[PDB]
Amino acid sequence: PVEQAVLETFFSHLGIFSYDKAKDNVEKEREANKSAGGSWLSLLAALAHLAAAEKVYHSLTYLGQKSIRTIYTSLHNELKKVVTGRGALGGTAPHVEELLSHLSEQLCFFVQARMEIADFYEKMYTLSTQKFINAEELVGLLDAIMKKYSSRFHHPILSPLESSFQLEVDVLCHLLKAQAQVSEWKFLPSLVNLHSAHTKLQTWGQIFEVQPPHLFLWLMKLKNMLLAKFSFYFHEALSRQTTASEMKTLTAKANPDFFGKISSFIRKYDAANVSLIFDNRGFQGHGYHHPHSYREAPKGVDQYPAVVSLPSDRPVMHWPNVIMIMTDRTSDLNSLEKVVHFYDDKVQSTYFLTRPEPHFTIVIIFESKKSERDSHFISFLNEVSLALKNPKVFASLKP
Amino acid sequence: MRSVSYVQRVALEFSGSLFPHAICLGDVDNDTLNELVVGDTSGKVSVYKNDDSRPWLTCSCQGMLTCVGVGDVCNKGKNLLVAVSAEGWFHLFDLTPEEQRPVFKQHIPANTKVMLISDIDGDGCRELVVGYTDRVVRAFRWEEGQLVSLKKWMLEGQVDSLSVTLGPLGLPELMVSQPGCAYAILLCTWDVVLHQTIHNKNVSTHLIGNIKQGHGTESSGSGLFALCTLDGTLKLMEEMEEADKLLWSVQVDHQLFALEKLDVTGNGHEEVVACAWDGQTYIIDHNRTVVRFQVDENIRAFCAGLYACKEGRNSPCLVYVTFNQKIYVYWEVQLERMESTNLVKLLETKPEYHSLLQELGVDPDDLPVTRALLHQTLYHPD
Amino acid sequence: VLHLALPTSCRPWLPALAWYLRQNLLIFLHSLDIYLYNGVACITLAFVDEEFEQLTQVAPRLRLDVWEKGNISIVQLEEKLRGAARQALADAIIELQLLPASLCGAQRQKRRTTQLEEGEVGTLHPVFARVAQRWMEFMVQIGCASVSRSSAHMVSRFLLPSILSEFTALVTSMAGDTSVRIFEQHLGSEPEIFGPCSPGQLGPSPRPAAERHLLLLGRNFLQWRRPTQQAAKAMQRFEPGGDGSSGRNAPRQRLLLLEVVDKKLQLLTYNWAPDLGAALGRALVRLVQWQNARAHLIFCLLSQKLGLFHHYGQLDFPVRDEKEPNPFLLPTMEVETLIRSASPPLPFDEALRDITADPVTYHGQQFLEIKMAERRELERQMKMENLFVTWQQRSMPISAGELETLKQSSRLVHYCATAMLFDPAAWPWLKELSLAFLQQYVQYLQSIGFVLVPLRPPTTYHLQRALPGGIILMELAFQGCYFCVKQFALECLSMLFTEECDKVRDLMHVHSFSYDFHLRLVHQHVLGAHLVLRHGYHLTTFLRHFLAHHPDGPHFGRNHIYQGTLELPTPLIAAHQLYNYVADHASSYHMKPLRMAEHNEYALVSAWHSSGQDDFDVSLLVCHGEAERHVLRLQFFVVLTSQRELFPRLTALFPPLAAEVGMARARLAQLVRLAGGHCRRDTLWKRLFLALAELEELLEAVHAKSIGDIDPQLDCFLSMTVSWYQSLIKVLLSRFPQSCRHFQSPDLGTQYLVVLNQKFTDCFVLVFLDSHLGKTSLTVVFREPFPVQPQLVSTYHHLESVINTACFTLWTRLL
Amino acid sequence: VAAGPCPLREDSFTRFSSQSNVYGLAGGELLAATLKGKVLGFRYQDLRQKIRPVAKELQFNYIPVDAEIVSIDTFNKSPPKRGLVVGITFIKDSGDKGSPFLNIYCDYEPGSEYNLDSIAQSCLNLELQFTPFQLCHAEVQVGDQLETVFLLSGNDPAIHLYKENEGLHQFEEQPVENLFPELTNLTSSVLWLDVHNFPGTSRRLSALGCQSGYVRVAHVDQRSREVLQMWSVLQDGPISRVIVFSLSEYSVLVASMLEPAVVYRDLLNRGLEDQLLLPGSDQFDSVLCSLVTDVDLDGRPEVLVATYGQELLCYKYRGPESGLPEAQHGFHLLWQRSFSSPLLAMAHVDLTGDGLQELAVVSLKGVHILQHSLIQASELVLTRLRHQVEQRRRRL
């Protein structure tokens, strides 16, 4: 196909970001390659405008407050009326002229899927104020687009974009599922989803040979925060398989490293403990367990497992008043923005506490009065919580 | 055909039961004088010597006795007493200068019934042959020492007696009685051939052999053997050449259970003596002359042979075992003759009588004349 | 007034005669003494002053005055007085003229005087030969108060020795002071030549028709220098008639003189007490009467000894003398009391008809012994005649004595014995086995028509079988280490009983019974439910000994036995080690062990039931250099036992045996070749927990399951780079070098690594990679074929810890 | 003590089913009766160089199957008249008391006088009215010639005589005092009676013994019919046997049943006074039978005593010719035999026919025949004949 020889390269150059270069061949075909069937120029202009549309898409700065719907949907008659059946003299012989019809239908499906994904991103942005991002609803909503659009464009000419699209879909799902699974303490499911996302990313990503569009950078940012979020939660089940001075070299390699902060803090200020509690949300144990094993149901004071407790084991003689305080003022901390304070006499401990996440809650303890007005500690807890909640992580989706 | 009444007799006390083959006579102390050896089931053997009613000596062996004998089994030029029990025990006694313990013991297979001591092959060493109730015959030899098994013959009918006789060729043989009045030749031990002779074929049969025929021929000579049946028939034949010539046979009306050889006349020939359960003893020579003797008593065991009873002298003797715990020994069974004759037909053989009658002028033709002459010569010397 | 004349020869005999006279008048007259006679007459007499007949012809006289009233017969009174005087004179003459006469260095002289007084040696005095006898016979015509007489005849005279002892014993019994002498006449002389004889000489006169005499004199020897004193203590009728004063005494000495002329006794008792003397005479007459009544040997023994039973029988009344019949000759004869103890006690006509064996106690004693021998024969004959009809027709526990009589009346026909092989010493519980054997044989014997013989109160058993010909008896007993049976016969045309004994002898079958019993016991012990034999019994040695003893398969047995030896290759492991392993895991191979007995060996047993019209119980037993160690030599036995029958078959290699042994050989070979691997696998598995070829050798035969087949969540691990596996291996090697058994290749183009936990010995977990092809894997290894799930707990912990580092490896690849 | 061995050997022995009596024996043939009715005849048959004893049963006509034989006897008639006479006294069992009967057999037909077969059925039946004791025969000199008469002792103490009639040829009873004046006035029953004639002399001797032991001997002349002399003694026990014999001066032997058998010696000149006793002849129960015959082949008689104790004693008369006054010749025990059954009767006849007289002993079980020692007899005959030849040659 001499006519499609140019089109093959023009479309295949879009696998990597080559929108500016892709435009140039269209300009050449517009007038230099004149006297042709009146569908080639139409599809050339359509693809040229598609290049700018996708550039705006990848920019992910064109949709913060809308536009990003009109320009998006500004090619439906274009794509559909690109083909016009047959008629008077056009371009080549009536042998491969009607090859663009399948591509046009696939591109109509492309446009529809892109618009729905854009509405998806806008919905996420709008929801990204709240007080906690329920990942289960987002997962329940995203599967619809993937299911409906799956296998809706194929004429062995559009594999790259599809793959890219697939990546742009597939990657996200895992992280959100991870974002889901981690919120509910799923060790292996979250880990597998995250690793599959990492593996799938590299090929369509790191193989670039310009600065990746903000969409890519936010994906990287989200994964990178998820790594540290993942690392903190399971640290007490990961310290076992290595050496105390060995895991430092890795835990210092997470961009928002949490482990170092508390260890430094205990040295900086004579303390008693620091712990992270996870109520069972209405539960095998530490690590991976059998496909179906005997799990004795939670009973007694066991819905409050100290998942992580930094210096030594959790004080037995100092955990009767942590599930007294936990429910004794169990209203304010559910607003996820305040920190509790109790100073007593015969325990001499000040139990600061904040709720970064609905299920999880951090706590410290001292050996004397702490003077709640002392902002030294409160700032640390605020700073710590500012990252776990993923408020900035969800918010920063458009520069 | 004529009856006799022996009077002289010795009674020996003996309490206990025994088999018919558990009594014998022979020299045990090596003094050329025979002594009686009797073994009972109770595990004791008594020897009787001379005329003492009490036994000379009692020797005890472990088990129940089934066979006794006296002979040269060790082949060291001496006579020894052999005792064989039912469990296949074997005891040797040297009663030659207070039970006498044996000086040897050896275990053989059990179910022993009959014993025999003779040189069967002819190597110069005497062999021991033992019969069994399960129709088995087993020969042995003394090896300097113990007993070495030789051969083991199998038979169909029950065995009742073992005998050795001079074969047609001139070598010793081995005869075994067989029911139905039959006998088997056993090939010597270095397979078994049968011969028949007319009634119920399950009748017990006893055999005897090695019958003497002349004086001084006991060193090496045989050829005649006798068969007896429980239904009451006797027979003498000769085992010469190919066919066994039939010498004689008699039919009686008693239950015959014994067969021995004796010498009552003293002319060298041996007479066959048989006994019945009721005690009707028969003595028959080789010339069809029967002599009857009725003891009028039920008899357990019988034994005819040489014995030293009075003043150290071997004489023919008959021995019966009675149910009254007694053993009867007749010692003067010697007979001047065996047929019946007179003076007239005994003087008609020597030629001197005829010569004297011719010299006297009286012709030995008128019986009354010679009868009167003999009467005058005997009862009227002057 | 009357007077009587007296001879002058008694001129000085006045003191004696008067002494006699006072006695003589004392009898007829009851008290110059006054006497009263009852006509009634009073008599007063006074003596005054003045060849047998001359000396007593009736010179002092006697004057008497009698006052008679009524018919007193004065002439008769005078005659009586004269007779009394004459009798007194005769008595005095006899007393003083004959009684004092003797009957017949210093020590020797006194010895003859004693020998003459008692007179056993010497000669008789002339007085006691002719004079005395005639005198005492003559003073019997003249009425005197001291006289006796008796007479007898007897049918023979050999009774004399049989009367001479009885009479002296009798006289001694009635008179202590008496002695008897037996002076016999010398049979050449006569005029007082009486030669004393010794007590024991029987009859020293073989000559018949000889009129032997006897002089049986009896006198109290202590009556001399003694008639003055009281004598005999009232035994003598008289005493000194007058008075013993004035130094004069009458010879009141008594006497006794018996005499015989051929055959005629005659007593002459003098001075015996009247009643006692009359009783003495009566006793002698009765003694002779009894001796003569003891003449029936002559009648019905001596006569019948020569076939004369019809000529001289019993109670035939021999001789009809009408003197005083014969008290002992009555129809009621005490025959047994007259041939023994000759005395007058205080069919017989055919006695000796056809029986073969002091003459009185010599001729009938053999008759008594003959009559007793018949009773002894008769009792014995009834004792062996009631039993025959009792046992034959009727269908009582005969005692020991009856059994002994039956055995001594029977003949021994046949016997047989068998060997008891359970006892090692004959190569508490053995007694029980012997009792069971005996009981089973008793059952077999009663099943063929025999009746057990009970024994009433006073382990041998007796069984009988009554037949018209006679009684056949058996005896079962244990004698040492052998079981023996004896057969007795007792005949009661005459050859059918012999046939009956022969046929029963042919049905004995002891050897076949022992064969069946031994094989049945072997089978029962093989199951082990019937623990008859003692524990630790060497069954293989017992089987070998039994086969050696019966290597021919006794004729009418029903059970069968076979022995064979199996040699197996066993090339990999040692033969003895394989045998030990199979014995240890015998339960896994449908086999059972046996602890035969301080060395202990183990034998393998098995059994099943095969009914191929056979219905046979099948028993199988198996027991045990470098080439020898590579050869599994094991000898095995096959035992077949019947179910229904237990007794030897009455009528007359083995297909069942060969059929069983074929598949037995096949199954043994299959089991060996299958169990070799089951041992090889499990041997070095244990060694693993301490080689690469050894490591691969297991994986050929182990049940291993992939991680993708236990939990699908692990499926992600199946599709990642080998470098991740290398990282994993390094982490585990650093973490559990104790549990990590790393294996390499001498090309380093394949590695095997495993990790166990000691306690969970059931399964370890291995990784695998080739690094050339990239064929990396991951599996979990299970030695056994783990059966099922629903429709292992300690297994997932390996799947926990091992997977618990798989994620740690993943985490490091993301930080 | 026996002064030598017995030279008699037993030749034959025939067993009797039933026992016999002392009178069973009779008379080269022998007759033996059985109490149960059986009668047997013993003889010998010659065959070349051997003999065979023969005992044959005989059948007698008028003895029923239920009769019991008491006594038998036989004899030959006088030389003037041939014939063999047999007499059997038995008792019919019909009735409480048995009925005695007498049968006399004699074949008067010519050609069968000695034929026992024809004699066996010639019975003449006679009533008795008394119990028979013994049947014997005697020889009397009547008129000019000698006649043999029968004698039978009965239950009544009297001997009954039966004479053959010269007319109708029967056997009729006759008074006993006509020919035997000495056989009258008896008391007991005669058990054995013997009559010994004197050859070439008209005188004879008679002896008898009764059950009471009364033994009577009498010398009687035949032609004069007068009792020449008379003796009697009273012994003890039944008299089993009395025999008149001359030792070397006639003598009588009495075998009492409870006293030793003795001889009396010199009857004619000493009567019955100086007896000689056989020493120790009463140690074997009762002497049943007796015999006086030569047994030592010396020409002088010997006494044979058979006892119930199965003894066959032989006493040899030592001769007074030997001159030993201190122990003057009497009788001494020569030899002694023994049997197994009591001996009842004895006989001395040449049964075989060799001149050597046999000894036939009838005992409770049967008849034994005893012959002399064949070797002893042969040598003695040879040496005697040689001595008689040398004496003839040298002295003549």
Top residue of B107, B111, B296 to mutate, by most chain C CBs within 10 Å, is B111
Q: Are residues B266 and B358 in the same domain?
A: no
- Per CB-CB distance under 8 Å, the chain A contacts of C790 are none
Per-residue three-class SS string for chain D: CCCCCCCEEEEEEEECCCCCCCCCEECCCEEEECCCCCEEEEEEEEECCEEEEEEEECCCCCCCCCCEEEEEEEEECCCCCCCEEEEEEEEECCCCCCEEEEEEECCCCCCCCCCHHHHCCCCEEEECCCCCCEEEEEEEEECCEEEEEEEEECCCCCEEEEEECCCCCCEEEECCCCCCCCCCCCCCCEEEEEEEECCCCCEEEEEEEECCCEEEEEEEECCCCEEEEEEEEECCCCEEEEEEEECCCEEEEEEECCCCCEECCCHHHHCCCCCEECCCCCCCCCEEEEEEECCCCCCCCEEEEEECCCEEEEEEECCHHHCCHHHCCCEEEEECCECCCCEEEEEEECCCCCCCCEEEEEECCEEEEEEECHHHHHHHHHHHHHHHHHHHHHHC
Instruction: Give the separation between CA C350 and CA A157, rounded to whole angstroms.
Output: 160
Q: Kindly state whether C354 is in contact with chain D, defined as any CB-CB distance less than 8 angstroms.
A: yes
Q: Are residues C304 and C287 in the same domain?
A: no
Q: Kindly state whether B231 is in contact with chain C, defined as any CB-CB distance less than 8 angstroms.
A: yes
Judged by CB atoms closer than 8 Å, whether chains meet at C206 and D282 is answered as: yes
- Per CB-CB distance under 8 Å, the chain B contacts of C481 are 87
The residue type found at D367 is: V
- Per CB-CB distance under 8 Å, the chain B contacts of D379 are none
Between chain A and chain B, are at least 3 CB pairs below 8 A?
no
Q: Are residues C351 and C431 in the same domain?
A: no
Residue with tokens 């070598």: B171
Is residue C36 classed as helix, strand or coil in its secondary structure? Answer: strand
Q: Are residues B270 and B367 in the same domain?
A: no
Q: Are residues B169 and B259 in the same domain?
A: yes
| CB-based contact D256:D264 (threshold 8 Å) | no
Instruction: Give the separation between CA A227 and CA B165, rounded to whole angstroms.
Output: 123
Judged by CB atoms closer than 8 Å, whether chains meet at C408 and B64 is answered as: no
**Torsion of the alpha carbons at D166, D172, D175 and D178, rounded to the nearest 10:** 20
Residue B335 lies in a domain: no
Between chain A and chain D, are at least 3 CB pairs below 8 A?
no
Instruction: Give the separation between CA B235 and CA B199, rounded to whole angstroms.
Output: 14
Residue C59: which domain range? 8-97
Last residue of a domain, one of B311, B330, B349: B330
Strand B2-3 to B290-294 pairing: parallel
Residue B336 lies in a domain: no
Specify the number of domains making up chain C.
6
Q: Are residues C522 and C637 in the same domain?
A: yes
- Residue in A closest to C790 by C-alpha: A292
C262 closest CB neighbour out of D234, D341, D342: D234
Sign of the CA dihedral running A147, A148, A154, A160: negative
Q: Which residues contact A119 (CB under 8 A, 6 or more apart)?
A: none
Q: Are residues B42 and B114 in the same domain?
A: yes
What secondary structure does DSSP assign to A330-351, as a single string?
TTGGGGSS--B--B-SSS--B-
Instruction: Give the separation between CA D159 and CA D176, rounded to whole angstroms.
Output: 7
Report all structural domains of chain A as residue ranges with CATH numbers, in order of start: 2-86+96-230 (1.10.3450.30), 235-287+301-395 (3.30.450.240)
Q: Kindly state whether B326 is in contact with chain C, defined as any CB-CB distance less than 8 angstroms.
A: no
Of C478, C475, C483, which is closest to residue C453 (Cα–Cα)?
A: C475
Residue with tokens 């004035």: C246
- Residue in C closest to A249 by C-alpha: C815
Spell out a b/e string for B284-306, using b for 16 or more CB atoms within 10 Å of the CB, else e: bbeeeeebebebeebbbbbbbbe
* Resolution for this experimental structure (Å): 3.0
Cβ atoms within 10 Å of A143's Cβ, excluding its own: 11
Residue with tokens 């002891």: C510
- Residue in C closest to D342 by C-alpha: C356
Give how far Cα B92 sits from Cα of A213, B83, C342, Å: 128, 7, 61
- Structure determination technique employed: cryo-EM
Q: Kindly state whether C693 is in contact with chain D, defined as any CB-CB distance less than 8 angstroms.
A: no
Write out the H or E segment, with its range, that includes residue C800: helix C796-812
Q: How many residues does chain A have?
A: 399
| CB-based contact C27:C105 (threshold 8 Å) | no
Instruction: Give the separation between CA D134 and CA D88, rounded to whole angstroms.
Output: 10
Instruction: Give the separation between CA D105 and CA D85, rounded to whole angstroms.
Output: 6
Residue with tokens 């009959």: B114
Gap from C756 CA to chain A (nearest CA, Å): 17
Helix residue ranges, H only, C700-761? 722-735
Touching partners of D (3+ C-beta pairs < 8 Å): B, C
Q: Copy the structure tokens of residue A256.
A: 């928002």
Residue with tokens 């004796």: B262
| CB-based contact C246:C15 (threshold 8 Å) | yes
Q: Kindly state whether B180 is in contact with chain C, defined as any CB-CB distance less than 8 angstroms.
A: no
Q: Copy the structure tokens of residue A97.
A: 């002229």
Residue D202: which domain range? 190-277
A191 closest CB neighbour out of C804, C807, C815: C807
Gap from D241 CA to chain B (nearest CA, Å): 25
Beta bridge partners of D346: D361
Beta bridge partners of B89: B107
Of A287, A195, A233, A235, which is closest to residue C800 (Cα–Cα)?
A: A287
Q: Are residues B350 and B325 in the same domain?
A: no
Neighbour-count burial of C324, counting CB atoms closer than 10 A to its CB (0-12 exposed, 13-18 middle, 19+ buried)? exposed
Q: What are D's interface residues with B at a Cβ cutoff of 8 A?
A: 9-13, 15, 44, 46, 48-53, 294, 297-299, 338-340, 350, 352-357, 371, 374-375, 377-378, 380-381, 384-385
Is residue C218 classed as helix, strand or coil in its secondary structure? Answer: strand
- Per CB-CB distance under 8 Å, the chain D contacts of C158 are 236-237, 258-259
Residue C640 lies in a domain: yes
Residue D223 lies in a domain: yes
Q: Kindly state whether C723 is in contact with chain A, defined as any CB-CB distance less than 8 angstroms.
A: no
Residue C419 lies in a domain: yes
Last residue of a domain, one of C48, C68, C97: C97
Judged by CB atoms closer than 8 Å, whether chains meet at C495 and B231 is answered as: yes
Q: Are residues B134 and B259 in the same domain?
A: yes
- Per CB-CB distance under 8 Å, the chain B contacts of C495 are 200, 231
Q: Are residues C119 and C213 in the same domain?
A: yes
Instruction: Give the separation between CA C433 and CA A42, rounded to whole angstroms.
Output: 117
Instruction: Give ∠ CA A163-A164-A169 in degrees, rounded to 5.
Output: 95
Q: Are residues C118 and C175 in the same domain?
A: yes
Q: Kindly state whether A202 is in contact with chain C, defined as any CB-CB distance less than 8 angstroms.
A: no
**Torsion of the alpha carbons at D104, D107, D112 and D118, rounded to the nearest 10:** -60
Side-chain-side CA neighbours of C626 within 13 Å: the count stands at 1
How many beta-carbon contacts under 8 Å exist across B and C?
Answer: 31
Q: Are residues C113 and C261 in the same domain?
A: yes
- Residue in A closest to C734 by C-alpha: A242
Residue C622: phi and psi, rounded to 5, are -130, 130
Residue D205 lies in a domain: yes
Judged by CB atoms closer than 8 Å, whether chains meet at D9 and B336 is answered as: yes
| CB-based contact B363:B357 (threshold 8 Å) | yes
- Per CB-CB distance under 8 Å, the chain B contacts of C416 are 111, 133-134
Sign of the CA dihedral running C223, C227, C230, C231: positive
- Residue in D closest to C303 by C-alpha: D238
Cβ atoms within 10 Å of C446's Cβ, excluding its own: 12
Q: Are residues B302 and B272 in the same domain?
A: yes
Of C710, C761, C805, which is closest to residue A293 (Cα–Cα)?
A: C710
The residue type found at A384 is: V
- Residue in D closest to C362 by C-alpha: D285
The residue type found at C677 is: G
Touching partners of A (3+ C-beta pairs < 8 Å): C
A238 closest CB neighbour out of C800, C803, C811: C811
Write out the H or E segment, with its range, that includes residue C439: helix C429-446
Top residue of C306, C310, C311, C353 to mutate, by most chain D CBs within 10 Å, is C306
Q: Are residues C459 and C360 in the same domain?
A: no
The residue type found at B210 is: N
Q: Are residues C693 and C710 in the same domain?
A: yes
Q: Are residues C621 and C550 in the same domain?
A: yes
Helix residue ranges, H only, chain A? 2-12, 19-27, 40-59, 77-81, 100-127, 135-149, 159-183, 187-204, 214-233, 248-251, 259-268, 322-328, 375-388, 391-395
- Per CB-CB distance under 8 Å, the chain C contacts of B200 are 495, 499
Residue D229 lies in a domain: yes
CATH number at residue B61: 2.130.10.10
Q: Copy the structure tokens of residue A185.
A: 């303490």
Q: Are residues B31 and B128 in the same domain?
A: yes
Specify the number of domains making up chain B.
2
Residue C136 lies in a domain: yes
Specify the number of domains making up chain D.
1
Q: Kindly state whether B343 is in contact with chain D, defined as any CB-CB distance less than 8 angstroms.
A: yes
| CB-based contact C278:C161 (threshold 8 Å) | no
- Residue in C closest to B324 by C-alpha: C408
Q: Are residues C286 and C301 in the same domain?
A: no
Q: Kindly state whether C365 is in contact with chain D, defined as any CB-CB distance less than 8 angstroms.
A: no
Q: Kindly state whether B369 is in contact with chain D, defined as any CB-CB distance less than 8 angstroms.
A: no
Judged by CB atoms closer than 8 Å, whether chains meet at C411 and B277 is answered as: yes
Strand D171-174 to D190-197 pairing: unpaired
Please give the DSSP secondary-structure letter assigned to residue C301.
Answer: I
Cβ atoms within 10 Å of A154's Cβ, excluding its own: 11
How many beta-carbon contacts under 8 Å exist across C and D?
Answer: 88
- Per CB-CB distance under 8 Å, the chain C contacts of A189 are 713
Instruction: Give the separation between CA B21 and CA D213, rounded to whole angstroms.
Output: 60
D355 closest CB neighbour out of B3, B345, B378: B378
Q: Are residues B256 and B352 in the same domain?
A: no
Instruction: Give the separation between CA A199 and CA A211, rounded to whole angstroms.
Output: 20
Neighbour-count burial of B110, counting CB atoms closer than 10 A to its CB (0-12 exposed, 13-18 middle, 19+ buried)? buried
Instruction: Give the separation between CA C775 and CA C728, rounded to whole angstroms.
Output: 16
Gap from C331 CA to chain D (nearest CA, Å): 17
Touching partners of C (3+ C-beta pairs < 8 Å): A, B, D
Of D175, D188, D179, which is closest to residue D206 (Cα–Cα)?
A: D179
Per-residue three-class SS string for C758-777: CCCCCCCEEEEECCCCCCCE
Q: Kindly state whether C792 is in contact with chain A, defined as any CB-CB distance less than 8 angstroms.
A: no
Residue B251: which domain range? 2-330
Gap from C206 CA to chain D (nearest CA, Å): 6
Between chain D and chain B, are at least 3 CB pairs below 8 A?
yes
D355 closest CB neighbour out of B339, B345, B371: B371
Q: Are residues B175 and B275 in the same domain?
A: yes
**Torsion of the alpha carbons at C311, C314, C320 and C324, rounded to the nearest 10:** 170
Q: Are residues C133 and C281 in the same domain?
A: yes
Q: Are residues B362 and B238 in the same domain?
A: no
Rg for chain B, CA atoms, rounded: 23
Q: Are residues B35 and B85 in the same domain?
A: yes
Which A residues in the span 72-131 are in contact with C, Cβ-Cβ below 8 Å? Answer: none
Residue C114 lies in a domain: yes
